[model samples]
Target: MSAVALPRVSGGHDEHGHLEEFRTDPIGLMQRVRDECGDVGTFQLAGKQVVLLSGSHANEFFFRAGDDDLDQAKAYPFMTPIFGEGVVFDASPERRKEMLHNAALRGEQMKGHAATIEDQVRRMIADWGEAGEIDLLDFFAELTIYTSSACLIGKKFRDQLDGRFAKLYHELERGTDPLAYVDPYLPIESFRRRDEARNGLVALVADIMNGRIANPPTDKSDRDMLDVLIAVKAETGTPRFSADEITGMFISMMFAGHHTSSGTASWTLIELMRHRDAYAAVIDELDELYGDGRSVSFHALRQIPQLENVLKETLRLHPPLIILMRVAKGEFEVQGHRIHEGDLVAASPAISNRIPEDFPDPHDFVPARYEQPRQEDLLNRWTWIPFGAGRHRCVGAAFAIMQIKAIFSVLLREYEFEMAQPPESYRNDHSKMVVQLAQPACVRYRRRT
Candidate 1:
């Protein structure tokens, strides 16, 4: 086997490396490395060497590799406090997925979410009435929170709680400072607020958990995500988790549930509206499918393949979490290059999904590219991964898509949208972890009478 040390991309002189550049345009940096230095190259990100893996071959190796080879859970130490210790960020790779599968969001528990999502969307947009303009991100930001809470946290909790939970969650998210990865214990005000938010969240969740335990539900359909967490079975009944652990899982799941979805949902609507003919076709599909006043149920959702394509195509263009990173634990071989302990391994959906060879006309909004006879996205599974691959994948993948579909199905049926702001002017705000539609992300809507 040929041995090689990967080429290192220079970022000039700054002991801390390219912090602002990486934070602002990690995708562009990764793209440059790939074009200039080939598939595997090392770049300094915040003073750490990040081995960026591009293309399907590298992505498959990076995501599917064993934890002994690349430890993702350990690489992301910043999430420990936000998600609480011993949960998502702290657990073993095997344990993380197991805990997520058991108590967190999964396909098995989300059977009723399709209907629940549409119901929540109806309540949210009902006030928009006949005509109005809404900031697309603002609408989805609030809508995703409501839908995830109603579906994942249970309808009863959704009913009983006010908006404080949302406020607290936002506070908790604000604590995710980019510098926190270096030293989360740096005595920061955001960290202080985040800790307070965690306490507020624990109190709220504890009250709800105790209430559910005292008066348990008789029907399975009435049960919420909290119930699922509380009923985690080691012997087939009763919770195996303590209140603190459950709250941590709850916060982690909420993060999984909404943060990424709102951005993707906003982008999907933005793209569809930008491509006028595509937007018309989508409105037609919604109008024709539910003309009889049918609800957007889970099974019924499968019927709108075109709508699904639009969503998929949007994801290809603007995935929320652009990159996935892991810290190396042991020596690993990649494309004749050696990566050692403490070296960061990374894969970027933002770069990989847009490779010109895999996706022709990569920069354009072309929804039909996913249709049969030209199924571009189907050429390779790992090529277009908006969500990370394998266990590194987002636990809320299916639920996220389902809620977005539910939101759009309910919304587009009642109204038609116009580009309130020209799509080209809009850009991604990458200051936060989840990439969001920056500003002037507004859309005009009129009730389809």
Candidate 2:
């Protein structure tokens, strides 16, 4: 990592400068971002303002601090209809806080979000241990849905909700794509599917919220987040969270917790398989810390510094969100620049992550920068931000890292991983709000011993 230097885009790339599309046909576009743009390039998308932050500074400035300031309200307006207006996330500041605090009571099971996530990872390693092959993307998506469901709906009801939400998840994803939204100007089949999914998801949450209301937990022995939300106090006189609100919150939770982490995990695995040396370093760290080759404890979680580096590197190489879109909320200064309201602000992490200044030899994958005595001093800065920054920084940023470390800790110790095909050519879907790779990442893994 070095002093952060933002680069300017010279020649434009694609119609959208979709880095992923250029990935299919690599040329001056990928070369420019990797070489000139400093891996984080900012340009106009359909004449909208956007920035592409990559490498360390891009990560720190955009993901760490930038997310909290940006606020999801400005970043994801289209989601209001998908997640519902009242979701603690999509709600306006005052209403969001009130709803969030009340909704917190309904989320007793969510408290174990990290623990629940790790448990599922252990299961994935166990299931894949025997199979000589597995797809990292497919494996994690299914795992996340099952695990998130358990936390949201309780263990007994996980299976029932898994498939239902998975399909809804796809529909929700399609709804985001321009093609799915019929008439783009008016509602159509995709709109109907989105509405249907929204309704179904709401219904699911209502079932749980209503049940808890009918029979509240005694002593609140259950510590799951959903349970907590159910018992929380309300602030509004006219119902803080109605049936629709409950549904929207649950659906939003699913989107927030499941897909993002799963995408991170898949990219992490891809980076590991592709960069054998970095993977070996992580394995060595795991072997020394947990000699028995078993599960990781919560406190012992921080022991694997190299694994953290691996995660950071993966995030830098492959960010979940390719296009960071935000509408200008009036005019403000960014790095001493002036802009007005309604002017869309955007950034590209894919290009920014590879800037030569922040990351020497920008394109090479190296986890060492995130480890060592540097972890606290140097790594603490914004050089690596997968989650984004400011008012819109992902609420689950810490949770994402914890879950990835825990799961990776279990898997690396238990199984050996490798790519099934020419791993370099592995496909990715960067045309999404968050870059998504088609699942079942053509991988093959065998038992360690």
Candidate 3:
């Protein structure tokens, strides 16, 4: 087919034609573009012709795009130092794949650590006591950080430095904005704090690993990811990872797993509160499973499929990571739209999951849509991607889901909550790494009698 000009989204252009609107409301901006400009659209941003691919077909191509054709490293040059060199986008495709596989939680590993994760969930929510009001986002953010530290890092780290860990992590996270990507050491307080916090984390993990090496554990019955990673050896019995690599990998794992889980869990609670029917349905399921308000077990979490569906539907509506980017290496065509080499390509779950054809009453919260017959099944495989799709998809998705379920299972069983803000005040905060509420989502709750 012959080449054609990509649809350029109208408005929001300054005298220099920069996409100022993207900085303000990326979700709304992309949605409007998809609705009016069709699946394939373009806009000028930071002096580049950025392409937004919206439909399921576009998502299929974008997610499945070969590394050679769409280099993630080039697409996200800003992430190289933050995620560490020689990993994530910086590594070769084969190496990146290898690192991902090695870091993944095997089924057996997850099964073995189920109790550990459950305990973290219990320890976190148990603090709220009989009744209180809280910013749900802040609460889950802390809970997930602690849970991730305990489960992914080690219980030692969690026990010894939970408070310091949380603070440093907050500093580190504050520097992950779009501006930070431009210059992580920008001589500003936020950037300075980010650098300091990142250094502290790397040093902290390195210290933990050093202690393990100096005094190897006598018992390995309940090893966490840190133990597994440190113990990994080559066939020749040489260590598989360098000190830097280990630190880098741990950082990536913690950030990836914690951020997504916290935001998604927070949104799940918010959505459930907003949709009373869905909330009541989920609470009924939780009550049947844990009427005594007991902490949830791994087996019991799986039994509450309604709770799972509620989280899934929440992800469908308010996925943590809304936009994914890639750099096109060569000319390509999708649905007859020609894309040339060196184009900046993006696929947005925020846009694709809301397609009217794929989701009837697309804007409404309907947990049952994910139940029997699964309306999501009828759509393209790429239609409902919250953790993303294809080779680079999240390794900790199941772990995330488990933590979310465990937390909510306990919370819903023990307390009832009401939104503290007007529903209209809630909107997506696109500036953060994970999508969050534009305003603090406060909720008042009391222990169930």
lDDT for each candidate structure: 0.76, 0.60, 0.72
* Winning model by TM-score: 1
TM-score of 3: 0.84
Q: List runs of model 3 lying over 4 Å from the truth.
A: 1-4, 15-19, 86-93, 96-104, 179-190, 203-246, 290-295, 300-303
lDDT of 2 by residue, 1-449 (tens): 84333355664455544433433432234445446655345443433434544445444444443333443354655465776666434645657544432342233423365466667667656545465876666677777777666654455446335456666666665455432111232365656777777777767767766776687655856545565555555675344566686666666656666767777888888889898988888888788877765445452345567788788878877777654565555554454444355554555556555556666666777776666644422543454445655555556655567768767777787788889878777656644443467754788877787
Candidate 2's error at 211, in angstroms? Answer: 8.7
Tens-place lDDT digits, model 3, residues 1-449: 85667888877566434345665677877887787678888866656677889877888888888888877766654455556663323565567645543444666666535667777767876778888898866777777787776766677667645556666676666665544334544576656777788788777777877887787665655555667767878799987776667767766657767667877878888888888988898888777777665546555436577888888888888888788888889999887778888888888888787888898887998888877787573355787878788766766777778777777876787789988988766666766444555547788999888
Q: Kindly list the per-residue Cα lDDT of model 1 for residues 1-449, writing each as its tens digit.
A: 87556797766245557555676676777788888778888777665778888888888899898877888876765577887873423565577656553453555655577888878888888799789999866677777777777775667767656567777776776676655656766687878998999889888888878887787766646666666767776685656776777778767656765667878888888888778788888878877877777668753446677788898888898988787889899888888878888898988899988999889888888888889878787776777888788657766677777777788888887888887766687677776554566777778899987
Give residue 390's error in model 1 in angstroms. 4.2
TM-score attained by model 1:
0.86
For each candidate in turn, the TM-score is 0.86, 0.73, 0.84
Ranking by lDDT: 1, 3, 2
Q: Is candidate 1 or candidate 2 better by TM-score?
A: 1
| Runs with alpha carbons beyond 4 Å of true place in candidate 1 | 1-5, 86-93, 101-110, 206-246, 292-294, 298-300
